[PDB]
Symmetry: none
Subunit: 132 residues, 2 copies
């Protein structure tokens, strides 16, 4: 119950923004800001994963010039156990594409899909919105 | 690239984090996703009123069978000043349909659209997915 240290790993872009935020908001260290972030997050809008079918949307921004990236996302979707209702792509700038994936599946399948796609090289982010 | 740094905290706080009760692979992943969300929120919070750069996706679930709800939503969007880049619509059942609205505009115009849409009768669900340039210019 003293002071523990643990390691966190960020992509440069995220780290640089964190560093910028530390300065702008008057924090003294990365450790201090991240610590404050964790206190807040714990107490705001705790859902046990279950077998209930739910409808969900995955918003993905990725590098459209990254070869095989879409194939890999398709591979992950195919094996995810989720039922993809449809996907929509648009070009948001000369490099980036924004894709919305509307799908249904249980908690385990959907969370698994978001994490696997989000961890792909070329994927800027994969943000999940679920309903029920 | 991926940079690793250490976060110092108390065991008591770490223990609450470690629980995830939720389905999360790891601490480092949960903390990272926490950091992303907060940083994006902070970014949107200081947005220039003259900025129309922001990208976002509005996920809406509503009663597709409720007459005039559609036009009501369109009227609101038309008066928002935001720009709709693309809308996708799928039918769930008689009284439910889902819509993903890809938006571009000022952070506060976009948030306003969400709040207005969400307060309409027949709208069951309206959630914003926010994006910041530091996420994808990088």
């Amino acid at each position: 119950d003293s002071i523990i240290r643990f390691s966190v790993s960020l992509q440069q872009n995220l780290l640089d923004e964190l560093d910028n935020r530390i300065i702008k908001n008057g924090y003294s260290s990365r450790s201090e800001l991240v610590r404050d972030m964790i206190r807040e997050k714990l107490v705001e809008d705790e859902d046990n994963p279950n077998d209930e079918s739910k409808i969900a949307v995955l918003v993905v921004i990725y590098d459209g010039g990254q070869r095989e990236l879409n194939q890999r996302m398709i591979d992950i979707q195919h094996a995810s156990g989720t039922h993809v209702l449809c996907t929509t792509h648009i070009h948001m700038d000369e490099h980036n594409c924004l894709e919305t994936i509307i799908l249904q599946g249980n908690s385990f399948e959907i969370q698994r899909l978001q994490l696997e796609i989000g961890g792909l090289r070329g994927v800027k982010f994969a943000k999940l919105t679920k309903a029920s």
